[PDB]
Amino acid sequence: WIDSTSPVNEQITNPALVEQIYHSNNDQLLWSDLATANHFEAQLEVIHRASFSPLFSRQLFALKSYRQQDRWHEYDVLATDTLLQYLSYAEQAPKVGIAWFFEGQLDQPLAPPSEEAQLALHMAIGNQSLARLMDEYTPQDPAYQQLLQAYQSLSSIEFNEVALYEQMERLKRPGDPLSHREALVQRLALVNLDTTSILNDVAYYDASLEKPIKQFQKMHGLQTDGVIGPQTMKWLNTSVTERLALLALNAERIRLWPTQQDSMIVVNVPGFDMKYWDAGREVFESKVVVGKTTRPTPVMNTKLDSLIINPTWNVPHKIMVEDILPMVKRDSEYLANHHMEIIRGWSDPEVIDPALIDWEAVEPETFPYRLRQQAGVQNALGTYKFNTPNSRAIYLHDTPSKHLFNNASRAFSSGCIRVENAEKFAQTLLANQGITLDDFPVSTQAIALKKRIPVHIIYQTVWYEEGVLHYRDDIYHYDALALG
Template sequence: MLRTRFIIIALLLVPQMVWAQGYFERIGWIEPGNTNSMALQYPQLVEELYRNNGEQLIWFDLQQSSQLEFQLELIDNAGVNPLLSNHLKKMRFYRKSNRWYEYDLLATDSMIAYMSYAQLAKQHGKQWFFEDRIMQSLPPPSEQALQSLYASVQSQQLGALIDSYTPDSESYQSLIKTYLRIASEREEIVPLYIQDTHLKRVGDILERRDALLARLQQVDIDLFGVNSEISYFDNQLELAIKQFQRMHGLKPDGVIGPKTIRWLNESSNDRLKTIAINAERTRIWPKQRNTLIVVNVPSYELTYWYGGEAVFESQVIVGRETRQTPVMTTNLDSIILNPTWNVPWKIMVEDIIPNVQRDPEYLARQNIKIITSWTSSELINPNLVDWQGTNPKAFPYRMRQMSGASNALGLYKFNTPNKRAIFLHDTPSKHLFDKESRAFSSGCVRVKHADRFATLLLENQGLNIEQIELADTESNKAIPLRRRIPVHIIYQTAWAEGGVVQYREDIYRLDH
């Protein structure tokens, strides 16, 4: 299927490419019949650029061409644009072969494609970075962008133009710094760390302590004060292991077990791919941090920003792999106190009805009522339902869990109207926040310390927090916010905090 799509794209572009090829053959830049020039995605724009530039080379400054190649390398390692990956491969071949005219043409074509990619990422990035790769040429960048390219060629300021289309956040810069360091060291042979017992802790002998230290150094763990001459697990090494565990979202207990070993033995190439895709994803996340809520799914964390500061941070529980919490943007418009829960059809069919078939008292114990429809308050007696003979998918009614201590939404629902019915809420299962991995929900986001979160949201909007205290027994008490708050649910498995890159498990396998 993909092969067919490439053939169709190539056939559509052949007339333009051949025409441009003829021009560059006439001025002596490529040999007649050289089919490599057929790789140009924007042949007419490329020809126009060189005509306007007096048929002179554009990429004679190796620093600027290396800067472009690096951006293409990130995109290549992220695996999002096979066409640019192919361009990069050919550019490097031409450079090593000293075929500078062909290199120049392909670099110019790649620059146009990179500008288009950067401009469209905000609009299409969620698809590119989480669903489908870019399998065909992108439309040319805007007219204004092309004018900037013409001007940059004339003033020989292509490096500044590349910078203007590249993320500039501190987190991005830290990711790139780490990427460059790992890339510069990846040819070094670092042995895997292996231990003879399931767990290692302070006081144990370490047969491969040298390999352990080398693996820790790969991710810039501070080994100051760690003695490299001894062969046992000492207190200083324990501090380094805890630092490594925090960096990877593990329980910082200082014990070397299977999860810690797996992260220790992560290859340089895999880390580079993880950093690359997450660096590219920074193009689509919100830049302003005035007032918004960010949920990062792989880190199981929520951050509420107000007035440019992070005023509330909390652990969260997200959707399990079979019911993933989606990457999305919505708005928080109200807080619902003592909410009832309209059970989604999928959960009713796949979870609740099978539970009732096994345990007739399940509905009563969970305080779940059967209703004829969402718009009706008519109740159906569960004792009149033939549960064993019921096909869950053909069940004609709906279910609603009444408010109370056992309600799946807890005591607070943070309402974010959207087609996917994804929202934030409290939970009665607070023991789950003690887990390292917290992908347990059916897609919605459960918030630890939901009471504090609700109070802070109301305070910052100048609303009366006494309404919370007055709503102890009232169901579905809605408190509308005066100003809606953007909620961004993101998926970032690598990011920087204080200049240090943090890594998390790719729980939905969306990185590669």
């Protein structure tokens, strides 16, 4: 009850509120219920495995230390401080959580949780329903439930020996012989695919393996070609440990995304997909190109205020000096081909004549003007820019290069987000705000939206959709470390 002058005196973030919660509940042990101490460790394990919080990792190991030393007096105190941390974490995640998973980490202790929460705690320790509290301060979002369910399932078969699928050749196409069928078949059953119709004692890659393998490649957003190449093996071979880690991370990540469907646009970068929910109903789905690994689309929340039809593209300074100018120094028919003008001024802007410029004299880094590409069907922004004002000038837009949408992995852009069915998207937006266009614009036309729509640009490499879990290559290395 009194401090035993132990290490625990430095482990506590807010000792003030801790003793106040004890004084109020008669200075008694709360964590004497083991099957409740388990359920709290269980949930910290998840946060540990996601490897985005140093703080919760260390306190979890501090508790696991005091549980192995049988020093349950000290385990009781820390566990309470930690549970307040947990509740702040649950509460503050959807507001400032991006900082913990992508920009930085949850390294340092949080503000104490809101009054609403502290009561809910005091009230829940009354009914000794600490367990149920923890579960109430997880997302009541089936997207979250599903990942956790799978996590629990795979945790049981974690550390159970599963042979690696190996093959002597680099590629195995349908009909080629197979040197490790038993292992391959197991590693499909392991991501919970229907393994039951696959024939048993077969030298080779028969029809019975063909759907399983494709369903598997679809599930991992790979090429659905039935060919068991390196990409398809990398995933087959990922250890249960590694998957659990993804489930854990992508689960605790869902705290950042509300899943509100009254009106929202979601871009999942690793999935390279985009959905627009209006009135709880998915009105629009589309493939998207996102930032290439070197110029990545950031994880951010912004708002779609307006749509521009036949948009002009004010070429960003980075792209002018790094890409375009260097090519104008070779191809003197470049500017005419790409329909790009040279421009002095953001205000009263004149069109500078290209031929008036000594081009093999130009240093791109100090080039004093800016490029503005005319509207056109070959304009970089195509026929539709979806205005999402923000400091990093990330927006959605149509693209002339529709051929890129065929690729499984669409990390090509400068950071902006290219929309496959841009025309349908724009139609859907105007329908869902009762904005009517008597005639289709022949010129650059801004259309203010009646209602700003939240745009959630997320990075989830694992998620549940139409019955099944989906995995995706950690294109921007945010899942690394959690994979190790």
